[PDB]
Design a protein around this ligand. Sequence first.
Ligand SMILES: Cc1cc2nc3c(=O)[nH]c(=O)nc-3n(C[C@H](O)[C@H](O)[C@H](O)COP(=O)(O)O)c2cc1C
Ligand SMILES: O=C(O)c1cc(=O)[nH]c(=O)[nH]1
Ligand SMILES: [Cl-]
Length: 349
Amino acid sequence: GLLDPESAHRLAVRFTSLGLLPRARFQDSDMLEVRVLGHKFRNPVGIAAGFDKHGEAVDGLYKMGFGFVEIGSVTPKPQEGNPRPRVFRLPEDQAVINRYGFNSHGLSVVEHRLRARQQKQAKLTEDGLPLGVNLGKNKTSVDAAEDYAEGVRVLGPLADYLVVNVSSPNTAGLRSLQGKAELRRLLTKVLQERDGLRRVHRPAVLVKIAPDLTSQDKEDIASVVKELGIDGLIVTNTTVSRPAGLQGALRSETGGLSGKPLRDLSTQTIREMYALTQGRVPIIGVGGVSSGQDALEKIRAGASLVQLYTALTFWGPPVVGKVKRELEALLKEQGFGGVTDAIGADHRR
Ligand SMILES: Cc1cc2nc3c(=O)[nH]c(=O)nc-3n(C[C@H](O)[C@H](O)[C@H](O)COP(=O)(O)O)c2cc1C
Ligand SMILES: O=C(O)c1cc(=O)[nH]c(=O)[nH]1
Ligand SMILES: [Cl-]
């Protein structure tokens, strides 16, 4: 916290990549295993997109004890992102605001990085540690569908799941892709491209949505997802809202807000999306998770898996084991046999 947040992030990625931090001691219980999206997940706690944008620290992140890793967002061509400053800590709120704008090494660079460890990843996936790849679009793209299609073609063969990220608040016009007609067109093309890949290279496709959607938006997304047979949802990205009560000096910076102020907004979005999809569409729940309780609330709301990022920036690597240990204890306390039993449990009350 003695460096600016962006410099701190860069060093964190570097240290993680090099495997400098200690191997996680917490051994995952059978209670934490989830089978979803055609894969086994040794535990349901993943690293959210944005920490490892360019796929530089995948192995280090598994070493940290994450049950799955999502890299990205990756754009077709390299791009620098928005001018600095573009990331801000709100310590009083346990929150971050960012406006990176999809800084990305681009598909080619990431493709080569993942190819260098493709067989290692195949073994990790087999051993219950899958890899997700989150796709974005270039700033000056005229056809968003073509950007996402290129992402499917290039990184789809290297991923257990792909994420169509239409919910960054930091790319002009992007979140209009969540609209029914735009989303149907975009996802039809994405699924067509995915279906064209050889079977062993054919990933699940998820859509990552905003926490800022209207009821109509959410109904429309649920409809499209079901119509097209989309494999899952990631719920949610950062919020452009600024909840009453934020204390951080930097609360009025432009960008997506993450961390504790997003937590319950995200949980409620999960709850709504689960109900709108009749519990038949896997949800990865993300936003403000820093404890076992936070994880379980999202799971009971309908998430099959959870992710965190912002908590890691406050609590450091120990937060991963802490979430897992606390989640295990709570499942036992509440009479669940395991994570699987708790998924969507609130809806069966
Ligand atoms: C600095 C930063 C960068 C992010 N970059 C991305 C990104 O490139 N793609 C994406 O889909 N989400 C991105 N996110 C959103 C996270 O994946 C996550 O949805 C959100 O931060 C809520 O989780 P958290 O409260 O645990 O951080 C980013 C978040 C932060 C804080
Ligand atoms: O600016 C980014 O790259 C970015 C930030 C964020 O919160 N979410 C996202 O999808 N991208
Ligand atoms: Cl390949």
